[PDB]
Amino acid sequence: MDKCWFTLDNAHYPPPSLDSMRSGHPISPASLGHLIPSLAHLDQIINAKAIEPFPATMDIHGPTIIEDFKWDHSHEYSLSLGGKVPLNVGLGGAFSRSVANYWEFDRLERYIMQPTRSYVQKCIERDEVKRWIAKNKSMMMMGRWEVYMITGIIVARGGGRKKKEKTTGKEFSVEVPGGKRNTARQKTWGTSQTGDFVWAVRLAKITKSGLHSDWKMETVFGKTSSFRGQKAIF
Amino acid sequence: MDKCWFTLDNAHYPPPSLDSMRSGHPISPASLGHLIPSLAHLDQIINAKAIEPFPATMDIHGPTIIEDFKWDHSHEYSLSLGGKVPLNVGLGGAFSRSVANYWEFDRLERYIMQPTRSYVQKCIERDEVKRWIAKNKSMMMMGRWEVYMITGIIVARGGGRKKKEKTTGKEFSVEVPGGKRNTARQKTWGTSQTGDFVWAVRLAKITKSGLHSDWKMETVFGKTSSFRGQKAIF
Amino acid sequence: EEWFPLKQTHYPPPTIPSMKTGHPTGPISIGHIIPDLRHLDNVINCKGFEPFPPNMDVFTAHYEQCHFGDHLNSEFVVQASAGLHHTNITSDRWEYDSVVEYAVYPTRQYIDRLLESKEVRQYIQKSKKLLGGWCVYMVTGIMVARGGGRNVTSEEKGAGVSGNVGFAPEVGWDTKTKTKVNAHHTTDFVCAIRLVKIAKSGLRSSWTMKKVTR
């Protein structure tokens, strides 16, 4: 799935202005109309500062505002294993990791646009995109292009308070003679971010198996196709 | 059965006016003089905006007013079964469903008319009705027409407060090894409807086995002939 | 039964001037003929009827602070390899404020001339053609409330069936239904009516008039 908003790990991107985003000015790397190979490669924008003009049928809809956004997430797990081989030797290994996140924000602002078949086809016919797909050299991906287009952006207006706690407990015991060692680490990071900056982005996956098939597009739900992709927050 | 008032599941129908209903203006789909195949198909009006004029012998009687109408209905049931087959495997399946409704209304207004033999015969001789009965193509219903005519309408004046609660508990246990799973869901819906709108309608069933037999009419009591027809409230 | 109470409130009362003019202004009035109690809305003499002769007159009665409450308990229990428990509990209460009762008495000649009406004669011919002996009912008196009255209804239906099969499956169904309805009517309506049965069969010289009690 239901949530399709992926949060960014970098907060130094300035927020685009309404006139700039209407004119398609790429002031920040994260902006509407950009094409990226993956979410983790946002800085690798395929478009070379050539944004297709928005036709009269394209609208940015409205600034959906969210107030008093406070969410808490504690993700803790603990694994243990025991390997005993005969003489008799026993091994006990325990690994506990707890990650507790606590975020509070005052105002979030949503902007969203709906891509059309004609607009995407115009974008995919650009020379830069043709060069980029020509860079592909493999047989399994015989014309298989997997590019993500930035479709929606939500911007935080006023910063927010972040708290992160990480507990790591590693207990390793070997009984033969015998040696046991415990390594307990507890890291904390409290912050009060101040300033206006983009908070999260929504991307629509565009895929095309080959020239014989038709290129399809769909909004990404759940987690991205990248390795260990972070799940959508909300 | 004694009660012959069926409540509607849609509340967006505007209430007809006294002058409009006298003139037979079909402002709303639910109005006097309309013919419907069934209660669930109220939007499928047989009449094509051609209401037979009311003769001098036809009256709408009077606006019977009901005040402080509060009714509570809790319908809960629980079924269970156990299937054990030998080796020995036992299965326990329980299903509990509870539906609690609570309605409060301030003012309800009743309008009712009494159909006559001549008026119904005039209506049944219309070309639209003849076309509709000609659409029937079967041998069991050799001229068998089952149409419902709207005879009475009760209109709520001031909205009302509605509360609905639905509890569903499904417990499924299998003992072999063994797996048991419980799914408990509890949905709530509280509402305060505001505005004037039609509340319920009374229909008179008209049936005719064939041309050899005479067409008969009778007010429907209890539940309608449709599948899983809702019983009359009051 | 003396009177048959109607469990309906969608029938406005006739006005006094139109009560005895031969053309009633209400759905139910003295002088109508109905095929049966269930088919109460199928008035045979919809057009009207002859005006009451000067000998005919209506007798009126008045009642105040009239209330009517009744209860009902039904426990159908079957014990055996199955168990059935059907419990019905019904409670009804009516509290009126003012009640008026109008009554009349028929006459042989008046009923005979009433049977000569176009709608009445058409129905009796159809009934005779279809059925061997015809029978109709005529409304004699009506009881009318004034200003409505409070109504409280409480219904409780509990059905429990437990069936044991002996692989020994068991089926247990336990359903319960509750309904509490409170109503405050604020308009006049017809409460109860009296019916006179007119029947004729076996090629009788004259029809037979009888009274019906619950």
Add this chain to the structure above:
Amino acid sequence: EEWFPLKQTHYPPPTIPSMKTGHPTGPISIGHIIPDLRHLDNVINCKGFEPFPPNMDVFTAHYEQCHFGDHLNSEFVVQASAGLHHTNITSDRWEYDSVVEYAVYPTRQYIDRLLESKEVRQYIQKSKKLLGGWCVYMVTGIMVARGGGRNVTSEEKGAGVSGNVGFAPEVGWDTKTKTKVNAHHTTDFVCAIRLVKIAKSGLRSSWTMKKVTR
């Protein structure tokens, strides 16, 4: 089901003047055609649609103090040489302030002339060429909140797997996830929609229109 609630708030409501002008000003409005519920953002008739005929009209309803709360418990337990315990606890609460509902009813001729649109006819030709029988959905009504509403979400997922191998290693995984989200929206958005299914297969003379309930 009557309505399908949307778990999305990035869709602004259309304005009243543009509701029935044939050119909506919002992402979702009455008169759009979508391939499926999941592909809700792929509006086939993006350019527009024919204006509503004078016979067509929109019916409006109003609601105040509307709230909706639900819970869910799922306990998948497997006991045996392994033990699995999957416990899911979900809680959702929506507290609105004012809700408006718009509904319409289609007509055979209006849908037929809608199918003659350039984008609609292109899609149906592609679907017929690819699939044996085509099927589409049309949005009929929309429910719009006013001023937003408070939302509280509480999710708890606990998965515990203990596997015993018999050198007799044992593996024990115990993961827990908690998520509590509080939101206070302060803008209008689309809550729920009604979908009408239009399908045709087997070389039918005319297409079939049906309703979809959850």
